[PDB]
Structures are given as C-alpha cells and as structure tokens.
Design a protein around this ligand. Structure first.
Ligand SMILES: [Zn+2]
Lengths: 78, 154, 99, 128, 112, 60
RNA sequence: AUUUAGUUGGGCACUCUAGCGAGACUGCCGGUGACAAACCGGAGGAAGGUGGGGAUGACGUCAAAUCAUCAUGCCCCUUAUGACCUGGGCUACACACGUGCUACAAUGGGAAGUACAACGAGUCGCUAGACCGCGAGGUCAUGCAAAUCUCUUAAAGCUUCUCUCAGUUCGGAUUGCAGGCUGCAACUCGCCUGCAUGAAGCCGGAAUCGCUAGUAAUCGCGGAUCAGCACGCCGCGGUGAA
C-alpha cells in the first residue's frame, strides 16, 4: 500500500525525479491512475488524464494519502 | 382431497401429565419445534394456575375444555356462488381444533409484556370463563343460528 | 509384513478380478494373504445446464465413482516380490505399489 | 460377565447398546441421563418397552451414539431396547410386535431436487 | 452538566452515563469502569460524589467533545475542499467501494 | 473479432493476475472447468458422444 | 492390561466399508365382488399392495429461443469492420417493478459452562503445537498424495442474573480512526476486524404465491468459477407444526 512500501510508478517517478529541485513546470502529460503520493512531491502541476481528455492539477503540500486520479473523474455528469 | 378421504394423525399424550389434548395445546404455540421455551413456559403457566386458584393441572385443563368448547361451527358451502352456509355439527376433532386455535391465536392477540404471563393470564382466562377467546365462543354462539336466515332451505 | 500395494480405478469388477489374480500369484509362491480391502469409493459432483442462451433451471448433472483397493501380504518371499515387480497386467487399470 | 449387544439406526446414527443388568440408567458417551441430554428425555419416549416387558425393570444401559440432535439419537434408544428384548424374551416378542416397537423408520433426509429451492419447496411464483 | 462530562441521564447506572453520550459507546466505557472496578447496583445512581466526580475527571481525560461535531466539520472541510471526489462521495454517503445507488437513496434523501 | 482471443492466451501473461483460461476447441470465457480445461456445454455434448473417460449420468 | 488418548498385546468380536446373495413381488388367508377384475381386513414381515426418491418426456402442440458454442447459404468490407497498446466501463442515480437478507421485540439479547453429523476438498495446496495482539492477523516450525493428517469437537437447547418494557442489553444505517490480507495496485473498481454518532424500522392495504409430512417453518457445514471477492447457486446435515 503505502506504509508497507509506497506504491508509486517508477518511470513516472523518473519523470518527476528529473525535476526535483528545479522550477515548478506547467504540464506533464501522463496517465496518473495507479501511483499514490508520499510528501516529497510538493509543488508540481502534472496533467491528470482521465481516460478521454486530460485535465491538469497543481500540487500543494497537504496531499499525503491518495492518487492523482481522485480529481478528474470519468463521469461528465450533466 | 379430490380422490377420497385421508388420515388425521392423532397425537400421543404427555409422559408427564398423561393427557393427550395437552399435547394438542403444546403443538400450536411451538414455533420451529422449540419445545424448550414455549412448552416449558406453558408448564409454568399451568403451575401458575396451580399456585393461584387451582389444584391439579389436568382438572383445570378439563375446565378449560369446558369454557372454550365450540358447540357449533359453520362452513361456507356455496351452490350458485353466493354466501351459503349452515351451522354444522362439529366433530370433536374439529371442536378441539377450533377451541385450541381460539386459545392460541388469542394468546397471539393478547401480547402481554412477559412471555409467559401472557400465557398465564391466557389460560387463567380460557380456564375460568374470561378473556376474549371465551368471548370468541360467545360470538361463535352468536353467528350460530344468525346466518340461519339463509340456512333453512337445507 | 513389508509388502503392500494399492489398486485404484473407476469400476469395481475389473479392480477386484485383477486383485484376485495378483492375490493368486502372491499366495501361490508363498502363503498368508491379507484382505482384498474395499475402500469406501470417493464420489464427485458436477452440475451443468442444458441450454445455451437462457433457461438456467434445466439442469443435467454428472458424477464420478472411483473404487479403490488396498492389498497387504503377510510373510513374503523373494518370489512374490518378483511376481509383483515384473507383472503389472492389466494395463487398463492403474495400481499404486509400495513394499 | 453379562452384557448385551443391541444396534439401532435412525437419522444416520448407529447405536450399539451394551446393556447390563442394573437399575435403569444410561452411560451415553459414558455420561448419565442428563449429563448429555436436556429435559426432553421423556418417559413414554425412552422407557416404552419396559411397560410391556420387564415391568417396571429396569437395567442399566451403556451406549455410544452420535448423529442427530437430542431428539434424533434418542429415537435410536428404542431400537436398543427392541433388540435387547429380542435377545432376552421370545414370548414377549408378540406383545412387542402388536404394540409395534420394531418397525424401523426408513426415513432419511429427502433428496433435494435442482430447479427448485429444496426437496419440495418450490420458488415464489411471482406471476404479477 | 450533569455530573460527568456531557449528556448525563439522572438516576441511571454507570454504563448509561457513558453509553448515551456523544462520543463514547460501550466497550471504552467497559474498560474505563474496569479501571476503577465498581458495580452498578442496580439501575439507580445514589452513590458517593467522590466516585462520580472522579469518573467525571476520567471522562475529562477522554475525548467527549462538545465540538466533536466541529472536529468532523473541519475534517470534512478539508475533505470536500481539496478537490475532492471523496468529498463529493462523503455527502453522497457512499464508501470507497461504490455502493450501487439504484435504490440506495433512502438513507439520506428519501427519494419518495 | 474472435481469432485474436484464441491466440491471445497462449502468450505468457503480462503480470500474474491475467491468467484466465478457456476451452480449447471453442472459446467460451465463462464457465470453463479448470480440472477439465473444457467449457460448460462441450462437456455435456462430448460426454454424450461417449469419449470422455469416467463420467456417467447421475441419479440417486 | 497400560491411557493423556484404545498405545500394542487382540482379532475383525460388535460396528463400518464393499462383493455376491436373500429380500416387498397380491407373496398366502378371510370377506365383498358373477366364480371376472378389483376392493375391504388379517397372518408373516424391517419394508403390503408399484417402500421413499432419482435416470428415462411418444405423435405432436407454440415461425417459442439459440448465426454470442460450433458448422452454416445468402447481402457487406478487407491500408479496415482485421490486428496491438494506456486510461475508462458495462458498479452512474431525477423514478417504477421482480428477487434475496435483517430486525421492526418482551418468545430478543449479554456473562458463564455444556453438547450431538454428513457430503467433500486437499503436495506450492489444507495448517500441529507455541508466541504476541480488543482485532482483522503475523511469527517459529510439524503433518498431509489419504478411511491415517488440515478446513473439521457444527446451531438452535440445557441452568442461573440481565435489559424488566423504552427506538430500548431490540436493531444497526451512514460517517472519523486503528488496522488486516490478496494482488503491479484496492478513490473508479475486493473483502474483513476493532474503536467511536446510534439511522430507519414501533408486525405490511388490494393483490399474491410455496406446500399435503422428518414436509412446511427454522439452524449450521462444504463445494464451484476463482490470487482476492457470497443475503446468490449447488448439495449436505440439525430441530420440527396445522
Ligand atoms: Zn467447449
């Protein structure tokens, strides 16, 4: 899960390991549905792809116990 | 049913009271064969009779067989579709069926806040002329010869 | 006495006729045969419907019967061991040998 | 020593009775009349053939039965007394048979058919 | 109010004075009464004031909060306002498995 | 589109929880018997053919 | 005899398993009935008038349904409708209806002890004993190709106090926290324990259906597809009405 090892996808981690102490970018197109968050991820803005159309989101410090796909659903509900 | 008649499966008496119809009173409240609760609190209720206005449970069971006893019965036997029946002579099989069904399904209707005081007051009523099951015998006496307006062309 | 074999198959008659054959060959060269032990024949279950697209209730089931035999031999000889290591006929039935 | 052997088969429970001349007891799983059994150990249920043979008796029972509830394997008790009196008294056997006492119930669990819920309980015919 | 923390019924025994309250069920009350080691005797509460105020302080130990609803309100104030999809699904009354709302609306809204 | 899913499962899997099996003469994904590696209805029919070892009809 | 155990002295004694048999077939007798079938009653018998139950559905009746098992003529495409990947979803909720489960209560609960089977499954699959946990469980490590050993000593009863009549020791709905396990991972989209608010329900109106007996009504066990995932299914056993 997270405490018996954080479940963060490795090559997307390698995409975000390249810009650790660098400037906060605007867009990283990804898939973003499997990796959770542990708190060394603060500050970025990574394009969350729902499955049809990607919608980005920026990153604060409070994000500690979930994934990136918890904010762009698969609904289009109206 | 349609072919012909059928047996009736008379019940065996108790090995404690030595009375057959007491077993017939046992086997109408007992749900899922739970003799442990229901039959034992029937024992407790007749011992409540024995402790207050009573001496032996068999004699007061016969006293309940007095004051609940269905003397008559009707059965809706239509001919042309209309409400047609007559006060028929009751079998002592079906007399016991009606009377003990009055007692048991009025113990259902009674519903007092102790699980055997409803049974205790139920058999204090059915053994001593009171309660609405004895008044169900009264109302059975009532419609006896009251549906007789359409029961004399027979 | 340090010789025992098992006989496992579907039916009963081929098992116990072959069991009587090998009991014959065993107590021929020596003596002291044990019992041709019937085992209580473990049974299977299956449950298959009849139709393709609908109609779940139309069941049509199948099962399996597997008789088994155990054979012990008391007071052996080298000749019955030679009979049991160079003769496993019939071949339509399968056995489970020990010593 | 003197002991008896009476077998009994009801509700999928064989019951070997090691009847010994005593006063009328039971050691069921080597336990007494209510060390194993609740209050449903009734008189005419268990002690029926004593009222027709060896009246009132009785003799002490050793038995080991499992299968059925408290009322099931108690039904295997009557077969033990039946086979015991079969061993003992040939002339009381006719009084046993005319009182029944030996007709084994051939009833087991009924075969439960597919297509339904149970052996006979059909589903709710929700027509409309 | 009345004698021990909050939500105290009068002339009821000691498990009732921790059972009715907003914050403590029964097994925590069982362990707290097991720490002291007294009997109810039987349903009425007519005993010494030192024990009642002592177990009042023992309730004052624990989290019987008059603003526990404010604590859950700030929890859901974070929860519905990061984004969040479980912040929406919280007010939907639906867990982290999906609860198949085809007739499952009579909990909250009463769709009749 | 049926012949892709016949040659699909003969690969080694991508990860451990995609090892689903089906029949071999046909391709039913539901109700395959892992002790048979046959589907539902072909067991019944080839059982009526008198070719499956063992299996008899059931009545008790 | 020994025993914590039936260890091994003891053989299959009782039991049990499975092999061949005997067996319930109007088989015998009395009466009714033309002396005809048949019926009513016996004797023996465990089973009496085909013992209970299963397998086995004629001609056909209904353009019933199946090209989504497969074969399959006819019309269509073949740089796409054929094929390969990542995220989704078939699990969403403004409402109606069929089915299953739980209480709606003083026949219900809690503390205590005490019980009783059958069908099976089983060698990368079931866990002996012990340790540590409120707990999901984890840890050392044994057995088990099966009549040995693991699930696997089943539940309602039985005897005490209890909530002693209330949305309540009836009941548990949704929600925060501790977690536990499968998986590459449990927001979408697995299950479970425990701690904490204690929801609704305070016996159901037309119209319904199951069923003529170890059966209705009710309580437990196992198995399938399956790494995980049963109020469903398929069986098995326990109590047992009118
Ligand atoms: Zn197939």
């Amino acid at each position: 899960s997270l405490k018996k090892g954080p479940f963060v996808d490795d090559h997307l981690m390698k995409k975000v390991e390249a810009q650790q102490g660098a400037e906060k970018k605007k867009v990283i197109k990804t898939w973003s549905r499997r990796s959770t968050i542990f708190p060394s991820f603060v500050g970025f803005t990574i394009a969350v792809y729902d499955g049809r159309k990607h919608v980005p989101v920026y990153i604060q410090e409070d994000m500690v116990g979930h994934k990136l796909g918890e904010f762009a659903p698969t609904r289009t509900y109206r | 049913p349609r072919k012909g008649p059928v047996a009736k499966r008379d019940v065996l008496p108790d090995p404690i009271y030595n009375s057959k119809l007491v077993t017939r009173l046992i086997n109408r409240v007992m749900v899922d064969g739970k003799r442990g609760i229901a039959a034992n609190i029937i024992y407790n209720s007749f011992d409540i009779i024995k402790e207050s206005t009573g001496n032996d449970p068999l004699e007061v069971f016969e006293q309940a067989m007095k004051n609940v006893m269905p003397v008559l019965e009707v059965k809706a036997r239509r001919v042309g579709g209309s409400n047609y029946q007559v006060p028929v002579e009751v079998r002592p099989e079906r007399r016991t069926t009606l009377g003990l069904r009055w007692v048991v399904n009025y113990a259902r209707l009674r519903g007092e806040h102790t699980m055997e005081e409803r049974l205790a007051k139920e058999i204090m009523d059915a053994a001593n002329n009171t309660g609405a099951s004895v008044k169900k015998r009264e109302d059975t006496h009532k419609m006896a010869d009251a549906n007789r307006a359409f029961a004399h062309y027979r | 006495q340090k010789i025992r074999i098992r006989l496992k198959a579907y039916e009963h008659r081929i098992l116990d006729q072959s069991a009587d054959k090998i009991v014959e060959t065993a107590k021929r060269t020596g003596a002291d045969v044990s019992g041709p032990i019937p085992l209580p024949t473990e049974r299977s279950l299956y449950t298959v419907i009849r139709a393709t697209h609908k109609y779940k209730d139309s069941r049509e089931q199948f099962e399996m019967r597997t008789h088994k035999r155990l054979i012990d031999i008391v007071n052996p000889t080298p000749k019955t061991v030679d009979a049991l290591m160079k003769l496993d006929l019939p071949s339509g039935v399968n056995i489970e040998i020990k010593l | 020593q003197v002991q008896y052997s009476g077998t009994g088969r009801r509700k999928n429970a064989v019951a070997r009775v090691r009847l010994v001349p005593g006063t009328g007891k039971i050691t069921v799983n080597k336990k007494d009349v209510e060390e194993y059994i609740p209050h449903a150990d009734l008189r005419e249920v268990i002690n029926q053939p004593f009222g027709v043979t060896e009246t009132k008796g009785a003799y002490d029972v050793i038995v080991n039965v499992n299968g059925g509830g408290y009322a099931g394997q108690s039904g295997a008790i009557r077969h033990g007394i039946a086979r015991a009196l079969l061993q003992v008294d040939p002339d009381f056997r006719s009084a046993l048979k005319r009182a029944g006492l030996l007709t084994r119930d051939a009833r087991m669990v009924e075969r439960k058919k597919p297509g339904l819920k149970k052996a006979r309980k059909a589903s709710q015919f929700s027509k409309r | 109010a009345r004698i021990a923390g909050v939500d105290i019924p009068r002339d009821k025994r000691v498990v009732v004075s921790l059972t009715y309250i907003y914050g403590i069920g029964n097994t925590t009350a069982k362990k707290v009464l097991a720490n002291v080691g007294v009997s109810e005797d039987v349903r009425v509460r007519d005993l010494t004031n030192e024990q009642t105020d002592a177990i009042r302080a023992e309730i004052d130990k624990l989290k019987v909060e008059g603003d526990l609803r404010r604590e859950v309100n700030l929890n859901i104030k974070r929860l519905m306002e990061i984004g969040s999809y479980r912040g929406i699904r919280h007010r939907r009354g639906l867990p982290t498995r999906g609860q198949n709302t085809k007739n499952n609306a009579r909990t909250r809204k009463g769709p009749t | 589109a049926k012949k892709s899913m016949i040659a699909k499962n003969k690969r080694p899997a991508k990860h451990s929880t995609q090892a689903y099996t089906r029949c071999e003469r046909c391709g039913r994904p539901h109700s395959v018997y892992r002790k048979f590696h046959l589907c539902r209805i072909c067991f019944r029919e080839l059982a009526y053919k008198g070719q499956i070892p063992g299996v008899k009809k059931a009545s008790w």
